[PDB]
Design a binder for this molecule. Structure first.
Ligand SMILES: *[C@@H]1O[C@H](CO)[C@@H](O[C@@H]2O[C@H](CO)[C@@H](O)[C@H](O)[C@H]2NC(C)=O)[C@H](O)[C@H]1NC(C)=O
Ligand SMILES: *[C@@H]1O[C@H](CO)[C@@H](O[C@@H]2O[C@H](CO)[C@@H](O)[C@H](O)[C@H]2NC(C)=O)[C@H](O)[C@H]1NC(C)=O
Ligand SMILES: *[C@@H]1O[C@H](CO)[C@@H](O[C@@H]2O[C@H](CO)[C@@H](O)[C@H](O)[C@H]2NC(C)=O)[C@H](O)[C@H]1NC(C)=O
Ligand SMILES: *[C@H]1O[C@H](CO)[C@@H](O[C@H]2O[C@H](CO)[C@@H](O)[C@H](O)[C@H]2NC(C)=O)[C@H](O)[C@H]1NC(C)=O
Ligand SMILES: NC(=O)[C@@H]1Cc2ccccc2CN1C(=O)C[C@H](N)Cc1ccccc1F
Ligand SMILES: NC(=O)[C@@H]1Cc2ccccc2CN1C(=O)C[C@H](N)Cc1ccccc1F
Ligand SMILES: *[C@@H]1O[C@H](CO)[C@@H](O)[C@H](O)[C@H]1NC(C)=O
Ligand SMILES: *[C@@H]1O[C@H](CO)[C@@H](O)[C@H](O)[C@H]1NC(C)=O
Ligand SMILES: *[C@@H]1O[C@H](CO)[C@@H](O)[C@H](O)[C@H]1NC(C)=O
Ligand SMILES: *[C@@H]1O[C@H](CO)[C@@H](O)[C@H](O)[C@H]1NC(C)=O
Ligand SMILES: *[C@@H]1O[C@H](CO)[C@@H](O)[C@H](O)[C@H]1NC(C)=O
Ligand SMILES: *[C@@H]1O[C@H](CO)[C@@H](O)[C@H](O)[C@H]1NC(C)=O
Ligand SMILES: *[C@@H]1O[C@H](CO)[C@@H](O)[C@H](O)[C@H]1NC(C)=O
Ligand SMILES: *[C@@H]1O[C@H](CO)[C@@H](O)[C@H](O)[C@H]1NC(C)=O
Lengths: 728, 728
């Protein structure tokens, strides 16, 4: 008979996809967590030794969720008492374990509620953030040293990002940067004094008699932004009775004239640091390469070492300007910029010269630079087969730009089209990470021989379970939209027959620079909808989508909610034409940006879609943060782009919702897309006399990722989808 | 064929129910608003003089929502700029208009955002509350005198209630009482310093970038309560260069010892004030009659003038102890208290004596004392035909308690079973307000011979319209529960067919001291459901309900959510026996307490109910305010009633919601039963893995009373019910 992939199968994750997380600690060695044992593996041969046994964790008393070994391998840092804040930020407790005398350190411990901690890149020094201030510990058993004194809740952040820099700029909580040999500690300071607060109720545990108000400094579009300062601290002079030796690096004049962001930091040498700034407008970026002056302790900038990157058609980079990758000596660097054809490729910059040489070109894009030696450059691109939803590792010879070899293209062509890589310290070995379209495959390689050393994880146990089950098929193809090639995928039910008519669900994100259509293997909600419920789940990457050139990406510049929404409709019209698609039962669903598109599509009046589900959607762009919104939309002033802000709200299309069956879902504790967004939307539908369904989730944030809520939302969305599709 | 009463018919109020609101300003004259004209109607004859023409409103510029004429007929107050706050509270702008010179007052105006205003009982003195402080104007054209200096937003209230006193104690916003001749201005001061704030988001209009937080001093069960001070201000010495002359009256020792409330103020004479105090527990009440001392200015209490009223089984009175009604001389008063058998009846108290004499008796309850003369006492009761859901006017002779005449019973016995009354200044005339079971009929009567002088409004226009529509019928009957006869009502569809199986909707409130079964005529949502959708709507009054004696009422004392919930289930079980009720299609719905009962019924696991809707329900009693909750539940402490607080939450019954289809509705701006309640309820259901439906209403309070929100909720509830009842 054969069982199908059920909703319970996804929700409880009975079909476990395995992975291989390793941590490179040398040119040939890496650590790997195996049944809570830390094993030190050797790449050269394959032999492993016990670095830390599992019994060491058992005698700690607490459950350890993360560990971090010092580069000198003398000490390890144990992370416990994990408390999540935002997407990347969290607070935790930390213990240091001596590996020499196999004992715990109990004096001068890392304080509880620590916001960030990191080892220096050499030895066993520590830098940590507590109460918005930076502390440095030279020795694990010695007293720490306070570096900053300005730390203040919701106001001053030293060494860690505020809300907006975490989500939109750094994609991390950390704002600390040790110099390669630990001489210097660089950090950013964020000032949120003038940033307005978003407030919302957190109800907490049932026992809480009164709800509390969460207050976050969150700059909405056009609002007052956080200011930033950058300091380099000399850690050589750090001493109990000495002042902190620090130098403030200010941005170049062309950026200093207005509101700006610090978007990147790269340590070049011990005496050379690179800083990436961007204007508030985000179409003008500058790299400032600053040199340490030994006699004054200053970090000097010069116009010769300043490198401008602009965009005339839109914004710079994907979500941020691409990071510079410096040579060992630091006299030149390699960086992804847009070329003349509007395709993102690797350009070779000299540190004190303004012109660069492109080392890659074509109707495809370099995703990122992975590694660099004096002879080779390793990078990821979507060049292979001309499919942008694919990823491969490429190696280009530095002395001869023509010699470019693909190290992952032909290893497993059918099974593996989507690759990521992780290199050892001097790029002597690399782990390859296959993500699809077949079962994820983890392999280790040598860089000298290009040979596959061994299989680390092939997910054979997963293959054993999947042959028992009625798996759906994932087909990737292309269609024509307004004279432009655009990619799409379809999750097709098992025993797919083109005579029978199937209902259609459009799974959308369609955000700027994003990619919904790729060759990644995923056990998803759509997996169950095709397998058990026999629904076609299709996804489409139209205008505004990334990895296909500036032309396609910058198409929605200053006009969010237009082309990317219109293309979702037109592509579905094309899907509905196909004989196997029931035009009576067509739905659309999306998360966050996907929810906004879903809503805008459902407010279009296209008649194409019968129903849709929007989860935690943006409803009005003035409600979303400055960095993300202004990037694509500019400022919401009549002097700028207010007109396009006004006619891109979902509320402006409230009238057209009367035809469709709408499900609006939002978490009340959403710090990202605030509950306000769905609240104001629902109010405009109530006002318009539109009937629709709603679902709030108490104390859930943007991910609605708590176990029971995750279970509930998909259960509830399935019921709504089945009711709309008249499915038993 | 004939049309049915639609949902649009209810929501748009196409079938208008007329009424007759008049203002008694003498013992034989009253004012009435007709075509925007205020006419001085004479009860003695029937002739009406034009007091203020309709064109006078139009010259002012604004739209006027209320008027108030000074007792000497020299001035009129105009109320405009009405801004709602809580249930009774609002701010408004005010203009005084001279009737002599027919001119507006323009010098020294009543301030913007005035909280409360009142004329003195004689002459034309004005007292008002602005920014939490009291102001007295002796003359409308004269400058105002500040009475209090303590007024502070969310902290100190002079002359107006705080949240809890408005909702639960006074049932009004005003805390000001002029003395009969206007010599004294009495007021209460409320101090909310230690009362914890409820905070919730108000999103406001779409243009508001950041949501604001509303903060209300709201004491939840067992929390710190507002304190009260009572003052009497001698208004004779009020002068620009003079201090305020005031005396503070404190509660008697027996009440002073602990937490207490002021629940009633009654002016007896010019030198005699009556204060009603109640302990926090609300089972001990005292009446303090205080005498003005001319030589010192003090108001004196004496033990002989103190009248205790206690409850050993529950609480005192219904929601508060009944008010004392004093004779002209002030040496005696009549007050409704519980007699031997626990029925509420009028007792004749002497002012300086403890023992009282009951003037009424029987297995029925006096609803209220309306008027009193030297000869007669006029009151409202449910004596007639033994039905507690009926009201009638009765007159009892003060020299002979045998002579009691029913003045309303036999005027229209089949049309009028529910009555209200408004008496002239000396009780020489009265208006009789009939509310059912037939169309409302408003009449005028003399007290001399009790003759129907004329018909003021008889709803003839509505009667004409009702002939064209298929009206449902209202059946009132009795069922026996555990050896006690309780009353119930049923709204039956047009052309009732005994062969067909009709779906059943239970409309519940069930709050302590409440009544869902009455003879009141109501064009309602249930009207539509019977007429158009052919659904039987039933209501029932079980244990805990009022107007049937203390035994039934106090049945749920310290155990809310038990007996009243159990009686709803068992009564419905009895209704499902009837051959015309489809036991497979029974629903239950309710608002506030009705939402709580609905929820508690649905989670009872009775299997009797298929589905249900809870609108703005209490989910946990610790979340609700101190006064209401503690009255019935005591304190949520292990020493007191925590055990019954714990097991009476809806969240504890979460597991049983898997058997039912649940719809949970709450307004996000609910200041009464906070959104927290449904937020905590939904979270527990999510935790239990229960599927259910939800609907938040942005910025709506406890009444969800806005135009579009009102329309939307019933539309949404109608579609949910139809889907549950499998109705096309
Ligand atoms: C501690 O490490 C031991 C290895 O010494 C783990 O034992 C292994 O358990 C797996 C199943 O998870 C077996 O398949 C292996 O045969 C075991 N290894 C050997 C060689 O004994 C043990 O699981 C670890 N303990 C904890 C806390 O998980
Ligand atoms: C906001 O308004 C603009 C201008 O009126 C819209 O842009 C037009 O979109 C239609 C597509 O239906 C095109 O045919 C026109 O060429 C566009 N006009 C201009 C001036 O560019 C835009 O679509 C509106 N935004 C949304 C989200 O509805
Ligand atoms: C409202 O009540 C509070 C008590 O809760 C009063 O605050 C006190 O004021 C006195 C005299 O000024 C101070 O000595 C105390 O420190 C306060 N008590 C506490 C514990 O807070 C306040 O005075 C009252 N307000 C009014 C106008 O009556
Ligand atoms: C929770 O509190 C008590 C738990 O003992 C419940 O007890 C009462 O109700 C029972 C109904 O099954 C009766 O059989 C018991 O006689 C009665 N307890 C006594 C001895 O007084 C109570 O009903 C529960 N309340 C709620 C809201 O469910
Ligand atoms: N997650 C992403 O695709 C990108 C990646 C990235 C890269 C550099 C710096 C930050 C980020 C985070 N990314 C984002 O898209 C962040 C956005 N806030 C996600 C988002 C977009 C629209 C609406 C809601 C929302 F959360
Ligand atoms: N409206 C009512 O039935 C009573 C009447 C009354 C009498 C004296 C003083 C105040 C009041 C107001 N009444 C109330 O029941 C107030 C309650 N807070 C209403 C209520 C009860 C349960 C749950 C929610 C809710 F708003
Ligand atoms: C692996 O074996 C080699 C033998 O030459 C040894 O040098 C190396 O230390 C071993 N690796 C481990 C597990 O440390
Ligand atoms: C933060 O900025 C404010 C102005 O917005 C300024 O007054 C304050 O001094 C700054 N604090 C620091 C430590 O930079
Ligand atoms: C630093 O100063 C403190 C307090 O004055 C003193 O105890 C300590 O000895 C000093 N440390 C050094 C290294 O001189
Ligand atoms: C950068 O953005 C600003 C403000 O939106 C705009 O005026 C300017 O044209 C942009 N510059 C380029 C190179 O497009
Ligand atoms: C009302 O009209 C009657 C007519 O009989 C007249 O006697 C009386 O004066 C009038 N009263 C007023 C002033 O309204
Ligand atoms: C004002 O009153 C007159 C009669 O005095 C009446 O005809 C007119 O309709 C009224 N105007 C309105 C509607 O305000
Ligand atoms: C009250 O005092 C004011 C100002 O101090 C003064 O102008 C006025 O004359 C005084 N009023 C009387 C009645 O004396
Ligand atoms: C009223 O209730 C309180 C608190 O439970 C109690 O201490 C007191 O004895 C009660 N009074 C009466 C007369 O029942």
């Amino acid at each position: 008979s054969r069982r199908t992939y059920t909703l319970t199968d996804y929700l409880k994750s009975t079909f476990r996809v395995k992975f291989y997380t390793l941590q490179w600690i040398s040119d040939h060695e890496y650590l790997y967590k195996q049944e809570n044992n830390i094993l030190l593996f050797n790449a050269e041969y394959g032999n492993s030794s016990i670095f830390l046994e599992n019994s060491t964790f058992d005698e700690l008393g607490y459950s350890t969720n993360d560990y971090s070994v010092s580069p000198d391998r003398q000490f390890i840092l144990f992370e416990y008492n994990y408390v999540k804040q935002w997407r990347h930020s969290y607070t935790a407790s930390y213990d240091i374990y001596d590996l020499n005398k196999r004992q715990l350190i109990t004096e001068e411990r890392i304080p509880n509620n620590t916001q960030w901690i990191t080892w220096s890149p050499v030895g066993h020094k520590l830098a940590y953030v507590w109460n918005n201030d930076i502390y440095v510990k030279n020795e694990p058993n010695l007293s720490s040293q306070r570096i900053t004194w300005t730390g203040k809740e919701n106001v001053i952040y030293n060494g860690v990002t505020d809300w907006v820099y975490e989500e939109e700029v750094f994609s991390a909580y950390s704002a600390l940067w040790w110099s390669p040999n630990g001489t210097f500690l660089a950090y950013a300071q964020f000032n949120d004094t003038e940033v307005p607060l978003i407030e919302y109720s957190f109800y907490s545990d049932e026992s809480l008699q009164y709800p509390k108000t969460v207050r976050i400094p969150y700059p909405k579009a056009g609002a007052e932004n956080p200011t930033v300062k950058f300091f380099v601290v000399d850690t050589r002079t750090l001493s109990p009775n000495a002042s902190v030796t620090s130098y403030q690096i200010v941005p170049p004049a062309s950026v200093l004239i207005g509101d700006h962001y610090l978007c990147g930091v790269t340590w070049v040498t011990e005496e050379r640091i690179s800083l990436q700034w961007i204007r508030r407008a985000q179409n003008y970026s500058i790299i400032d390469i600053c040199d340490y002056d030994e006699s004054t302790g200053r970090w000097i900038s010069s116009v010769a070492r300043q490198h401008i990157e602009i965009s005339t058609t839109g914004w710079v980079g994907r979500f941020r300007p691409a990071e510079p990758h410096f040579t060992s000596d630091g006299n030149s660097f390699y960086k992804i910029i847009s070329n003349e054809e509007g395709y993102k490729h690797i350009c070779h910059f000299q540190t004190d010269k303004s012109n660069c040489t492109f080392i890659t070109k074509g109707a495809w894009e370099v995703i990122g630079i992975e590694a660099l030696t004096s002879d080779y450059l390793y990078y990821i691109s979507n060049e292979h087969k001309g499919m942008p939803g694919g990823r491969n590792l490429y190696r280009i010879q530095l002395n001869d730009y023509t010699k470019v070899t693909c190290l992952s293209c032909e290893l497993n062509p059918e099974r593996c089209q989507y690759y990521s890589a992780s290199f050892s310290n001097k790029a002597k070995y690399y782990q390859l990470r296959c993500f699809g379209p077949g079962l994820p495959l983890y392999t280790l390689h040598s860089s000298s021989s290009d040979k596959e050393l061994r299989v680390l994880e092939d997910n054979s146990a997963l293959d054993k379970m999947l042959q028992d089950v009625q798996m759906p098929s994932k087909k990737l193809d292309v269609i024509n939209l307004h004279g432009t090639k655009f990619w799409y995928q379809m999750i097709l039910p098992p025993h797919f027959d083109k005579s029978k008519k199937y209902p259609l669900l459009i799974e959308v994100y369609a955000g700027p620079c994003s990619q919904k259509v790729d060759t990644v293997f995923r056990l998803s909600w759509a997996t169950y909808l095709a397998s058990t419920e026999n629904i076609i789940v299709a996804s489409f990457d139209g205008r505004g989508s990334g990895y296909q050139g500036d032309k396609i990406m910058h198409a929605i510049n200053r006009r969010l909610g237009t082309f990317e929404v219109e293309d979702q409709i037109e592509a579905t019209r094309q899907f509905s034409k196909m004989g196997f698609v029931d035009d009576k039962r067509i739905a659309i669903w999306g998360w966050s940006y996907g929810g906004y598109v879903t809503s805008m599509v459902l407010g279009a009046g296209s008649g194409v879609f019968k129903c849709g589900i929007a989860v935690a959607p943006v409803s009005k762009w003035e409600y979303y943060d400055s960095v993300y919104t202004e990037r694509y939309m500019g400022l919401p002033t009549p002097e700028d782009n207010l007109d396009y802000y006004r006619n891109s709200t979902v509320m402006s299309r409230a009238e057209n919702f009367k035809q469709v069956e709408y499900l609006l879902i939002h978490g009340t504790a959403d710090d990202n897309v605030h509950f306000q967004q769905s609240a104001q939307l629902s109010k405009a539908l109530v006002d318009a006399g539109v009937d629709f369904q709603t679902m709030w989730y108490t104390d859930e944030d943007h991910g609605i990722a708590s176990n029971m809520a995750h279970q509930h939302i998909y259960t509830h969305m399935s019921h709504f989808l089945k009711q709309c599709f008249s499915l038993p």
